[PDB]
Amino acid sequence: FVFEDCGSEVGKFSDIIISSCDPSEEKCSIIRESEIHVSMKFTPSVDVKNVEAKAFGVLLDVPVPFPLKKPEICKDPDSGVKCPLKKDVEIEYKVTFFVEKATPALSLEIMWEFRNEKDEKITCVKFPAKIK
Numbered sequence: 001f002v003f004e005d006c007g008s009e010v011g012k013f014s015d016i017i018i019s020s021c022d023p024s025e026e027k028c029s030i031i032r033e034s035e036i037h038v039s040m041k042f043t044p045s046v047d048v049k050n051v052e053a054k055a056f057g058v059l060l061d062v063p064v065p066f067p068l069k070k071p072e073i074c075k076d077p078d079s080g081v082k083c084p085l086k087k088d089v090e091i092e093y094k095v096t097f098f099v100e101k102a103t104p105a106l107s108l109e110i111m112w113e114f115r116n117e118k119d120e121k122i123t124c125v126k127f128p129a130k131i132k
């Protein structure tokens with residue numbers, strides 16, 4: 001599968017790594033009852049004062065918004081990212097989350113965005129996943 005760019009206007013990403021899956025697969029396997037480690041290498045094209053992350057699961061061609069626990073990336077002590085972000089400098093975001101047993105097993109497209117304080121997209125990543 002491909003970590004597709006779903007449109008960003010104030011940055012780009014170069015690499016996404018999800019511990020439970022490899023891009024050689026048809027869909028990204030997300031294992032329940034396990035810790036998932038996610039990394040993104042990205043570069044803002046402008047100086048960024050604050051970052052708010054957004055996630056969506058695609059259903060019926062419509063991206064449905066899903067709540068994140070720590071959307072203010074720069075204020076999360078474990079993210080590895082400190083604001084302000086400098087223009088043209090590649091940095092890396094890190095996050096670990098645990099997928100509960102109570103998580104339904106399904107296949108869906110995931111859309112994941114980092115926005116700045118101005119609600120402009122720094123990154124937009126889209127990929128197919130299978131929770132299994």
Ligand SMILES: CCCCCCCC/C=C\CCCCCCCC(=O)O
Nearest residue numbers: 038068069070071095097099103112
């Ligand atoms: C309930 C299971 C959720 C399904 C797993 C989604 C997998 C997508 C992988 C990476 C993009 C999401 C990154 C956000 C990490 C969550 C941390 C948080 O709650 O802020």
